[PDB]
Amino acid sequence: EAQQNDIKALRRELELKKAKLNELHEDVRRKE
Amino acid sequence: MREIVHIQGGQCGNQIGAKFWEVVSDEHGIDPTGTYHGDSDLQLERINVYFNEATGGRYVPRAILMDLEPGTMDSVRSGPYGQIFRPDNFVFGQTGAGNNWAKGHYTEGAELIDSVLDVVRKEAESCDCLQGFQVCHSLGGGTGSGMGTLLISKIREEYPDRMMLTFSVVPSPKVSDTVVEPYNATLSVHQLVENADECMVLDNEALYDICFRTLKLTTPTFGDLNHLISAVMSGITCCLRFPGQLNADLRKLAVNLIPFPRLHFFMVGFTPLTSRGSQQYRALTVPELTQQMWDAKNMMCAADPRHGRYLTASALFRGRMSTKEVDEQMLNVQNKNSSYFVEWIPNNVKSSVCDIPPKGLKMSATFIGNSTAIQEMFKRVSEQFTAMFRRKAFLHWYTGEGMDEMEFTEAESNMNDLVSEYQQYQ
């Protein structure tokens, strides 16, 4: 059960990081 | 002109097809007795794609029911839109496979597949310019999966140039009805990767989940789930039946969403889907349709697309709408969520607009994303398959029927090399 919690935490962190990355990419496109 | 022959297999195929012919007959304005009673002119000129004029305005569907148990045939014949089929098209065995893929693929199929092929041939050459065949079946059952799969292989041997659609449901461990689901689904996919043209993957978890969350139904019987699947199938072949500002046939969608020949497993979604209590609290605009389309909690598969990347995507729109709004919305979702899309492919979204909405609605949409998140289920299945096959559970029920150990190893091999190629292209 412990490893299951690790899975559902790492994906959520991974998801937040991917969303931040998209924001940065969008800003570069607008600024260029 | 362009022709679609319908083939339904097994209990799942028959009941899904029953609801399908209900909604298509209403769209073309045909009564349960078989005679035209519609109002608009538009509903007459494109009924040959699905019907045949017999005599005295009797339009009979171009369908083939196929199973091994009479309960499904009698339930079909009993209900409304049951007396519109030709009784000769109810090709029907007698013994029954019963969730044994070997029975439906080697023993019992061997005496039925001859009769179905006779009917489908006579029904195929009856029309002039065939567009393709349309099959609805399952991958957990025996007479649906095994016989339907064998029928797919024989058909692709005879007609190798014609198109082929397969609406197939796959089993998931959260909704697991039979015990031998992995043994069936793994072998069934082995044949689907080499025989079908494209497969629109379905599942019951997402369907039950959709009716809970978005539709907020209380008792979602199979009728409502089959109603949703039918609405998807009507949306995918609305371009042939009605004029639009931009048309996209079956072949047109296939070439724009399949970048490599073995990468033909899709996810499907339908919009708009709203609760009955909130149907009047909403607008009907293209941006609203797009927000509900690209929601990951709206696919009709239990595979979250945000767990991977989209290779391509498709949006078939129906209704009087401005094409500019269509392209701007597709471009907007292509720029803001840049990481979820593949990089060495710009323009991962093909779009199309038809001018006739489904009956009762103003504007609808159908989404077909070819993502690389679909590989989780194949891994989600293969881990179960190995769990049984490491220790030969239930294996003798198939071995004493003809399958040898090399067949299961081959099915694992094809499953494993497939999940690696999805992982490669992500």
Next chain:
Amino acid sequence: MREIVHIQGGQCGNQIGAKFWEVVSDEHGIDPTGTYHGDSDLQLERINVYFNEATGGRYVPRAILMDLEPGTMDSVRSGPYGQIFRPDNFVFGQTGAGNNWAKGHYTEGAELIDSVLDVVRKEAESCDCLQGFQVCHSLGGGTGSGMGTLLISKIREEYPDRMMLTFSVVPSPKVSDTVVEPYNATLSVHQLVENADECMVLDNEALYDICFRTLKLTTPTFGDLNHLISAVMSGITCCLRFPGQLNADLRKLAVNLIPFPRLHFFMVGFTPLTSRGSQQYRALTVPELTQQMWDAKNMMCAADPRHGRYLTASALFRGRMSTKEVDEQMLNVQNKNSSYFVEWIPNNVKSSVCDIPPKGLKMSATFIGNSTAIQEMFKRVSEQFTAMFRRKAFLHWYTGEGMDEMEFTEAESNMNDLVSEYQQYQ
């Protein structure tokens, strides 16, 4: 174009917001069904600020209800104008905090606030140009104070460049509904001074005083209190919805009334507010609105400003008025009582006029004064906080949830230096 998304938290927030949406919808001529039935074209020009057109005259309010117990949600859908809210905007927990700021800010908030954030995001991106957010809540309860304050902090780090109004009633010893009022108020104010752009102090004691003398009501239920608060909220944002000879928007008011980033606690009053027995004997001119505006017994807080000094003040006038009269009245009340005003700022009063009165009156006004006397509440609350915390009363319900002791000491220090810093500029 300029847009306000509305957020109601807790039981206090839900009744205040309920009577608020009735008052605005009645101003814009929208019936309980939610369809337009007004006459003037002017009422349609500025409905984008608070509503969205759905279909066929259906206007839905741009509000989000957020609480923890379903009694408030069902009481909202029961009453009139209850059928206008979109049912999806009823984001909602199930367990209940119950007058425990730690339960409202650490345990139940951590799983509800992602949901309320997602609704707010859709409501913010659904519109084009945000003017600000509008949050109504209390400071004594738990599901309003702790959760709402966490929502404020989360939103401010998301959209940092937009305004934000929060209307908060605060506890007082004479109206003491719960026992842990200071432990909730002191921690809530600590977060408000560092997050909110501007706050509008309210209290229930002054509202009861208004209903006794000015309204002369027999049975002042909560409906009338919410009626007064709603009239104030409509009065301040009237400038964005209607044109006038001198328009003053929310940001224009904020920069004109806040001299220093920590001095953003205002006391509010509204005129005319007269009993039905004396409403017949009255006249409607500018001087009679002012000398009822600037009366100390009309403020909606229990902080008498003549026990302090005025930094700045503002009046928002509604109705066809002469701007010369408006300015000379502000000049007269500032020249006579010069001691009550700050000395190193001349012309302490910002004034504006709008040309649309509320229905039922010919001329009205709305006063917003940023005095220094608001520190009476901070000392008045902090001593009760100290009286329990010196002896560790009720502490374990806060401590055993995740909070430690330095949180209370830091909160004490910040509230204490705040009342100290108000006193220095005094």
Next chain:
Amino acid sequence: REVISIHIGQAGIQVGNACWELYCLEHGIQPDGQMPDAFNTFFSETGAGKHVPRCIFLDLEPTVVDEVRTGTYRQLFHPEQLISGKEDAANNFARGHYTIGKEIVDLALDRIRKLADNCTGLQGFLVFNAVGGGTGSGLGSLLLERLSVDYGKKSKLGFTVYPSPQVSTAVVEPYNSVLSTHSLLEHTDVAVMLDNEAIYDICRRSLDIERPTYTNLNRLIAQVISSLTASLRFDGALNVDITEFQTNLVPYPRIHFMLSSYAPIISAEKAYHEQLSVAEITNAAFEPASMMVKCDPRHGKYMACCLMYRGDVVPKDVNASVATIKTKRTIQFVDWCPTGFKCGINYQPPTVVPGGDLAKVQRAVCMISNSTAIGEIFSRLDHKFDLMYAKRAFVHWYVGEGMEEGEFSEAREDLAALEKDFEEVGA
């Protein structure tokens, strides 16, 4: 010859609503834009019988612009002219000069270019703004900066509204006035001040209106502009142009601030019982009970004065009347200037608009003078601006927008230097 008129801010375009109202009612054009050649200075002709004004309304808040889009004159104004932003500067000079100004002034410029290109003998521009706000102050100064670098030699008549000494509506307006004048100093060629308390007192005493709104204020401002452009629009016995004021009234390239007045502002009843001639209106134009800026020229000394005369006026008595003023000793002129007057007479009387509170007068005088009493107002502004700046009140809003503490001190000493400049020319 043509002159285009630009309006910035809430007060700016409201003033324009009264001006173009007065213009069409003077030249006999209905609000829809068609007649039932002197209109060529302000209206360009489509060639299909439709006349369009040479003006651009622009501001940052869409409220005041869109009642104009739906009033009676929906069809008079070309749509592109009525520029409108999306959100207001909110009484914040920096916000109008750097944050929001930088997006909107470039659209105004590439508009105003084709207004000038349609013109042939462009006499100049004339701008309307109130310095108390953020739009009229911030992007107004920014617009004047870019106008000076574009044209330079063309006149820019600035009819500005300064904040009143005691009657005020905003609280950060001392900051806005000082920073705005810092650039209005070296850009506007001829800048006319129009206070608000002075106009309030005129409507209270002269027009005997005890309850005036902004409508009457804007009405009489349009009357002064009409009296000032009649010399350009129509022929008279002795006319002047807009390039005449550049030379004849400002002795030094930094002293350009004029006190305006107009006579006779008389209600409908006094005119019936009172007499109009040139001598008494020449008198009434000088008394401080009829000035448009709260200052007293009795405390100052005149450099040069200007006198617009409208209606049935012969030139012999304007000379005799100005002679009587010079022989009086209540007002005195600077030692360096022996002659201090610039006179002008035009044939057409001022027309009246229905609904206004101005009577139909046979003759009128519009006086525009330059003095040193204007130095007292600027000093009066410095006391209360410096009053709050030392403690750094309200500075955090402007510096949060992207400014610093440097521009306050450097703008402060520049206008402080101007105080010393005014005192040394008066000696």
Next chain:
Amino acid sequence: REVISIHIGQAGIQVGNACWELYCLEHDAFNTFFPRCIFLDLEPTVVDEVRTGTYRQLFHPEQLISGKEDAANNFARGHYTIGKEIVDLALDRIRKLADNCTGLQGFLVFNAVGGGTGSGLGSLLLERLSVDYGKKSKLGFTVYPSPQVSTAVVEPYNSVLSTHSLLEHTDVAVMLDNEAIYDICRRSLDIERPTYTNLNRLIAQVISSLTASLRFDGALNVDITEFQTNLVPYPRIHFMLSSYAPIISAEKAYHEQLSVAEITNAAFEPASMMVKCDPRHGKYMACCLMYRGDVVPKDVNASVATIKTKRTIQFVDWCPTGFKCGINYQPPTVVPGGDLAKVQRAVCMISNSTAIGEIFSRLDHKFDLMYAKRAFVHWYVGEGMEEGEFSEAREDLAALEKDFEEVGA
């Protein structure tokens, strides 16, 4: 004198459905059009909308050609597999259309290169027309895919493979994007939500303005052979930016004072080009100005002088006389339900420059990225193609880029 028009594809015949509506509404002057047309497509859905539409009796039944099944956004399918059975029937009709004619100026073709029918059998029709007639002009007004606005996925493959034949087959090729036209309808026509119908209406305006010289007598007439000389300085550089003025609504038109000087200017700003490219990066090689309606030669003469003396735009060092004017007397007509107001005079400008060299370079990367990983190539190869023609079409556009850079210097 007559000129016949061919329409290919979903985009081609919808453009024609608006173009012919304008021709009938506009009308011995008719002799050049009255129709001398052919619609042809592989999908029968859009052609048979015409067969039952309002213009049932207007078109002779045979004219409306229609295949059996679509090429489905597949250049190879519409050029090798399915084209081979319908193209022969089409051109063996167009021949007898030309035999009906006596003084044929030329043909004009309408196609979009993104699709399979517009691109594939477009080029196939062009190749048999070039070997059959050779000398007669064939004006091709094509629709190239936009850089950022896009509806298909494999359209880079189609656009490159179509261009390789559009070079040496058509005589005068006018680019038209969809984003640029969308921007035009958004900016000038202030239509915030446009559809394909509005685009096709103003495309017809451009076509009508360049054939009105044949139809009606003007002060300075210009034939189709005139564009052949005056705008293409090299046999392989014929790609024209288009523009039109005044594109204006019904209310704004009355308010503004349309004249010759300002519309000659407005037809030169990049805010009014029919192709998404910035000619500020390029240098004008030649310009052509069709004036319709109320035009005296003086103000058009004065207007080209002001353009030459401006420095916001530059010309090549080769042409001091870098213009070709043309004046016709009859004003442009209007369609009920159309959005363009009636104007005394209008200008359709067709130029040639090096800004077009940017669109090909922009196109190259998108095609290059997909081709490197061999995306979608298996569809085209199984249709009948090979890897040879993909790589060789790639190097043809590479040569064209160097060509524009060399001539522009």
